[PDB]
Design a protein around this ligand. Structure first.
Ligand SMILES: OC[C@H]1O[C@H](O[C@H]2[C@H](O)[C@@H](O)[C@@H](O[C@H]3[C@H](O)[C@@H](O)[C@@H](O[C@H]4[C@H](O)[C@@H](O)[C@@H](O[C@H]5[C@H](O)[C@@H](O)[C@@H](O)O[C@@H]5CO)O[C@@H]4CO)O[C@@H]3CO)O[C@@H]2CO)[C@H](O)[C@@H](O)[C@@H]1O
Ligand SMILES: [Zn+2]
Ligand SMILES: [Zn+2]
Lengths: 383, 134
């Protein structure tokens, strides 16, 4: 049915603190009378542009900022108009993540980066380099354990290694992304993905490992290390594993470069509740108490709100998150990002499984990531 | 800058359209001779990857064009509105057939005007239908 006037429907991914967000919604309803319903549908980031194009969907959509330029290009997001006093409450770099064609298209919530998570009892001194992992795994297999398991099905988790020696999505210069300069099939990307594939060939990782498998193995104490983001920490806590969060290993002496996501909240252009959505986001969620309620459910990472981040930054896990973030890069928000991710997803899965060589997999991903731009040129108006 | 049209590419390579060997930018397969001639007749643009020139084969052109239409269709306008928006007659605008990618002739554009057939915008590209693609 159509978006209901006089309530708020929110979509947020199932790995985030949606119960905590619902608590913020309950407070909003207690104070204002406006009911807030939080949902976590599957593939919400693919459902949103479909339903919103027909004028339906949630009033508010949460995702990392990389999806939002495509939504804005399709006219699916309301422009957001925080006063200068409110903008000053959040870190400038988080506003830039949600700035598209010079306009703010979402509210930034929290800064996410992947870190190396390690079991301190199994591995008191985690490896500084990727190159050490094979030997460390042989040592741990002799103890009935393994060195490292992390999700190999989503390119977010393998990108830090692919980028380390030179892979990139779109070249960034003059404050702008050059969509004609894609770095998926260059020598640095091949070197990193070759290292990953060699880990699999040499029985240090399995191509089929997904999020659930890696999480279960780490939280059961079966593997010494995983790679994950802040939202994963609360399940590790309840598992009673003594864990640390640290800088990702280097590759060829270069830092791993995670793609940094800013969890962001956009307002559906078709919402009849844009004013209520702004009041909820600015004056209930983006407060110390609102972010704390979400954070106590699943940790958000380094929040965009300065007053609360000043407390969270004292947590060494947050310091590690931001150390990895600073070595990585902010994701582009441009519409071409989704095609980039779908292309790299296929390349990593096909190379890891041996369906394609690293070279063929990345050559195809480079083309796929650029496919619409290539077509624009083929059909172009040129002399 | 590099040649964007087949004739200039042929001149630079001191070859002719009858002799030139081109590969598809997407699949890297060699174009059939028929595809080379069609590339030129459809006024397509040579594209450069890693500093090397490429054309496009018919299978890939149709595949990515269909995707682009299905995902990036926006809206439609009558020809007179295009003429007001761009301040030019249709004859001066590049409008390709949505099916065969050929630039529409002036007579085909005037046929759109006379028969009240709108043009469609896909990713900023304005399209109609030539006569052949009925
Ligand atoms: O049907 C075949 C195929 O379906 C399933 O995979 C699909 C996914 O279910 C689907 O969600 C979709 O995934 C895309 C996604 O739409 C696209 O946006 C892009 O995703 C990026 C994020 O945008 C980016 O923010 C980042 O996401 C992080 C996130 O920031 C962080 O907060 C936390 O949530 O972890 C996320 C990573 O999981 O990175 C991802 C990229 O990894 O790219 C996705 C594709 O990689 O499309 C999938 C493919 O169809 C099934 O899972 C699959 O088995 C089936 O083969
Ligand atoms: Zn082809
Ligand atoms: Zn035609």
């Amino acid at each position: 049915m159509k978006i209901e006037e006089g309530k708020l429907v929110i979509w947020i991914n199932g790995d985030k603190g949606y119960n905590g967000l619902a608590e913020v919604g309950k407070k909003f309803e207690k104070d204002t009378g406006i009911k807030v319903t939080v949902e976590h549908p599957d593939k919400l980031e693919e459902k949103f542009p479909q339903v919103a194009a027909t004028g339906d969907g949630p009033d508010i959509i949460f995702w990392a900022h990389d999806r939002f330029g495509g939504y804005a290009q399709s006219g699916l997001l309301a422009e957001i108009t925080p006063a200068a006093a409110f903008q000053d409450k959040l870190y400038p770099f988080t506003w830039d993540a949600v700035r598209y064609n010079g306009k703010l298209i979402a509210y930034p919530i929290a800064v996410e980066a992947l870190s190396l998570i390690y079991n301190k009892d199994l591995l008191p001194n985690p490896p500084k380099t990727w190159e050490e992992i094979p030997a460390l795994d042989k040592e741990l297999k002799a103890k009935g354990k393994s060195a490292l398991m992390f999700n190999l099905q989503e390119p977010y988790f393998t990108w830090p290694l692919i980028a380390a020696d030179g892979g990139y999505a779109f070249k960034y210069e003059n404050g702008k992304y050059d969509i004609k300069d894609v770095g998926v099939d260059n020598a640095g990307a091949k070197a990193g993905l070759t290292f990953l594939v060699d880990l699999i060939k040499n029985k240090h990782m399995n191509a089929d490992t997904d999020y659930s498998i890696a999480e279960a193995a780490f939280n059961k104490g079966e593997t010494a290390m995983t790679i994950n983001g802040p939202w994963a920490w609360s399940n590790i806590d309840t598992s009673a594993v003594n864990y640390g969060v640290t800088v990702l290993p280097t590759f060829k002496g270069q830092p791993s470069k995670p793609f940094v996501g800013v969890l962001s909240a956009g307002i559906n252009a078709a919402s009849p509740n844009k004013e209520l959505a702004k009041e909820f986001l600015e004056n209930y969620l983006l407060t110390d108490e609102g972010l704390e309620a979400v954070n106590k459910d699943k940790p958000l990472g380094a929040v965009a709100l300065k007053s609360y981040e000043e407390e969270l930054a004292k947590d060494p896990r947050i310091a590690a998150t931001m150390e990895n973030a600073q070595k990585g890069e902010i994701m582009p928000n441009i519409p071409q990002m989704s095609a980039f991710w779908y292309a790299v997803r296929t390349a990593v899965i096909n190379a890891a499984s041996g369906r394609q060589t690293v070279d063929a997999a990345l050559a195809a991903a480079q083309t796929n990531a650029a496919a619409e731009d290539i077509l624009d040129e083929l059909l172009g108006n040129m002399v | 800058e590099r040649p964007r049209k087949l004739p200039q590419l042929c001149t630079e390579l001191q070859t002719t359209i009858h002799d030139i060997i081109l590969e598809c930018v997407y699949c890297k397969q060699q174009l059939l001779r028929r595809e080379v001639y069609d590339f030129a007749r459809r006024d397509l643009c040579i594209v450069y990857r890693d500093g090397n020139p490429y054309a496009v084969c018919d299978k890939c052109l149709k595949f990515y064009s269909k995707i682009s239409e299905y995902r990036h269709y926006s809206y439609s306008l009558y020809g007179t509105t295009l003429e007001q928006q761009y301040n030019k007659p249709l004859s001066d605008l590049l409008i390709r057939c949505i099916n065969c990618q050929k630039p529409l002739s002036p007579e085909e554009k005037q046929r759109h005007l006379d028969k009240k057939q709108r043009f469609h915008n896909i990713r900023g590209r304005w399209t109609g239908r030539c006569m052949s693609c009925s």
